[PDB]
Amino acid sequence: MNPFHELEPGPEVPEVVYALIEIPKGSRNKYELDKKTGLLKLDRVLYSPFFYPVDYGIIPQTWYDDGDPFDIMVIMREPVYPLTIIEARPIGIMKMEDSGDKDWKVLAVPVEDPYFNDWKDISDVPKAFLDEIAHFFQRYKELQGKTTKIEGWGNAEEAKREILRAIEMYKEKFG
């Protein structure tokens, strides 16, 4: 099947969403769900020796300003495999402009890892961890000559509002 089109955005939107993971934490390979076939594709290898600091993927049945599904970052202790579904609780949102496009990213934790039970908003995350994620997105494209701007972080409510917006952008694009 095609996970992007055929999975709902979540079981309890926007408190709990599905994250379909494309890139496990620790990868330098930039995998993406091929929206046409539903297969994993290598988009590129990052040009710098950086690794994804989070399990990285999409919320199904969403769309966004960069012409792709809405980006989601899930904090996993043990990374998952590509194309794994995780039930995720949004706790904040990274505000990023990428090559002139709004490209904000939900920050979420797995509902079903009790380690994260007390992570519910952006203030629960170690500051240095937010900084490491922002810095990755600030510099990972530098050798590609693409401009990114990290504006800061929003809280869980702002993240949830943006999830609802992305869900509507999908309905409008794909009727």
Residues that bind Br ion (CB under 5 A): 71
Total residues belonging to the chain:
175
**Backbone phi and psi for residue 32, each to the nearest 5 degrees, phi listed first:** -145, 150
Give 115 or 174: the residue with its C-beta nearer to a copy of itself. 115
Least separation in angstroms between residue 132's CB and Br ion is 18
CB of residue 16 vs a copy of itself: minimum separation in angstroms?
13
Give contact residues for a copy of itself (rule: CB under 8 A).
1, 3, 6-7, 20, 27-29, 31, 34, 37-45, 47-53, 76-78, 80-87, 110, 112-118, 126-129, 131-133, 135-136, 139, 142-143
When CB distances are held under 5 to 8 angstroms depending on the partner's kind, the choice from Br ion, a copy of itself, Na ion, none that residue 65 binds is none
Using CB under 5 A as the binding rule, whether residue 98 contacts Na ion is answered as no
Please tell me whether residue 71 binds Ca ion under the rule CB under 5 A: yes
How far is CA 162 from its chain centroid? 12
CA 20 to CA 4: how far, in whole Å? 8
Task: Give the strand pairing for 101-102 and 105-110.
Answer: unpaired
Quick check: 162 binds Ca ion (CB under 5 A)? no
Interaction partner, residue 40 (a copy of itself, Br ion, Na ion, none; CB < 5-8 Å by kind): a copy of itself
Q: How far apart are CA 122 and CA 140, in angstroms?
A: 23
Structure tokens at 48: 């710098």
The answer to whether the CB of 156 falls within 8 A of the CB of 102 is no
- CB neighbours of residue 136 within 10 Å: 17
Does position 32 interact with Ca ion (CB under 5 A)? The reply is no
**Residues engaged in binding Na ion (CB under 5 A):** 68, 71
